[PDB]
Structures are given as C-alpha cells and as structure tokens.
Design a protein around this ligand. Structure first.
Ligand SMILES: *[C@@H]1O[C@H](CO)[C@@H](O[C@@H]2O[C@H](CO)[C@@H](O)[C@H](O)[C@H]2NC(C)=O)[C@H](O)[C@H]1NC(C)=O
Ligand SMILES: *[C@@H]1O[C@H](CO)[C@@H](O[C@@H]2O[C@H](CO)[C@@H](O)[C@H](O)[C@H]2NC(C)=O)[C@H](O)[C@H]1NC(C)=O
Ligand SMILES: *[C@@H]1O[C@H](CO)[C@@H](O[C@@H]2O[C@H](CO)[C@@H](O)[C@H](O)[C@H]2NC(C)=O)[C@H](O)[C@H]1NC(C)=O
Lengths: 49, 109
C-alpha cells in the first residue's frame, strides 16, 4: 500500500494476533513456545512432503 | 476491507460511469509518504510491572518516549489511560525502563 516500511518481526505477530481478537499480551508472554511449535510444524511439513 | 480489491492502497470510495458496452469505475485511494526513522520498544517497565499500549505503538526520538498510532504521526505523552498493565516484566524481551505519568496524583494536590 505504498512504500515498504521496516518493522521488527515480533511487533508484526503482535499486530496479527491483535487482528483476530486475541489481545497482544498473549504473544509477548509465550514467544519461545510459539517459536518451537512453528519450527516443529515446518519440519513436519517438510518430512510429509 | 479486502486489500487490493479496489485500488492500490487503502480505499475510500468509488464512482461509476457508463460506457459503450461496459462500465468505468473511478476509485479513490489513500496513500502515505514522507517516512521517518525511529527507535521502538514492545513494553514499558515501571514499578516492576509491565505496561503495553491499548491501540498504538511506542516510539522515541532519542530522549523521550511517546505512543503514536500506526498509520500516522502524532506523539502523545505516555499516560495511564492509553496503556494497560499485565503482570510483572521479567520474561519479555525488549523491555526498557521509564516513568509513566498519571493525572490523578497532580490533580490531587
Ligand atoms: C524529542 O522530542 C521531545 C518532544 O518535543 C523534545 O523535547 C523538547 O523539544 C523541544 C523542541 O523540539 C524543546 O524546546 C524542549 O525544551 C524539549 N523538552 C521538553 C521537556 O519539552 C526532545 O528535544 C526531542 N529530542 C531530539 C533528540 O530531537
Ligand atoms: C537486537 O539485536 C542485537 C544484535 O543483533 C542484540 O544485541 C545482543 O544482545 C545480547 C544480550 O541479550 C548480547 O549477548 C549480544 O552480544 C548482543 N549482540 C551484539 C552484536 O551486540 C540486542 O539485544 C537485540 N535487541 C533485542 C531487544 O532483542
Ligand atoms: C532497569 O531498572 C532495573 C531496576 O533497577 C535494573 O535492574 C537492576 O540492574 C542493576 C545493574 O545491573 C543490578 O545490580 C540489579 O540487580 C538489577 N535489579 C534490581 C531489582 O535492581 C535494570 O538494569 C535497568 N535497566 C534495564 C534495561 O532493565
């Protein structure tokens, strides 16, 4: 929607969680669990493919 | 609300016009420009507790900390009405020390 603007990644997942009704307080308290779950899921999808 | 359905950028309205064998839409779109640089922080620690912004984002030109909306620049002093508290800050990554001003104490005197 114009010119690209730099933004840290964590403060993008915060906005995306805020979008779907889950308040952003959740993300900053459980960041490591989310990272581990995402990495495990991507490994699983690579293995399945 | 679906992006890029009507125009390149945020959408405001459309006007229809006739044509020989078709229709012509004039979309009105809103596009920002003249950007800047800033240093951010996800939360503010005060008195051992954490403070997060209600709707906005924390910025700081280098000396003072403000909260501004995402799509435009209009800094405001960090008060206790546009921020909310959630627990104590020892696990968040990116906390920065500061003071959060409140109006009740000055209005009390
Ligand atoms: C960051 O912004 C703040 C808010 O304006 C600046 O603090 C004031 O700046 C004005 C001029 O911009 C001065 O006249 C005031 O004396 C400053 N202090 C106060 C309490 O109002 C601050 O100088 C800015 N910092 C930088 C590096 O630009
Ligand atoms: C932003 O990134 C920098 C480096 O890319 C981080 O600086 C590191 O901080 C840790 C402490 O947690 C040190 O052990 C490292 O040695 C630092 N690296 C360098 C190159 O100085 C910085 O902490 C990051 N900021 C946040 C909020 O995560
Ligand atoms: C923010 O303030 C806290 C509270 O004073 C600082 O944490 C202390 O830092 C000193 C210096 O390293 C330690 O000796 C203390 O043990 C720390 N804890 C306490 C309870 O005093 C902290 O360093 C400050 N800065 C940041 C970036 O958090």
């Amino acid at each position: 929607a114009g010119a690209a603007l730099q933004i840290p990644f964590a403060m993008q997942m915060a906005y995306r969680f805020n979008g779907i009704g889950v308040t952003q307080n959740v993300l900053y308290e459980n960041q490591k669990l989310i990272a581990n779950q995402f990495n495990s899921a991507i490994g699983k999808i690579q293995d399945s493919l | 609300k679906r992006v890029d359905f009507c125009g390149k950028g945020y959408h405001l309205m459309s006007f229809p016009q006739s044509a020989p064998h078709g229709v012509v839409f004039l979309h009105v779109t809103y596009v920002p420009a003249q950007e800047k640089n800033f240093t951010t922080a996800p939360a503010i620690c005060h008195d051992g507790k954490a403070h997060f912004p209600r709707e906005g984002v924390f910025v700081s030109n280098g000396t003072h900390w403000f909260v501004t909306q995402r799509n435009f620049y209009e800094p405001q002093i960090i008060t206790t009405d546009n921020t909310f508290v959630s627990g104590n800050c020892d696990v968040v990554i990116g906390i920065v020390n500061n003071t959060v001003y409140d109006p009740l104490q000055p209005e009390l005197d």
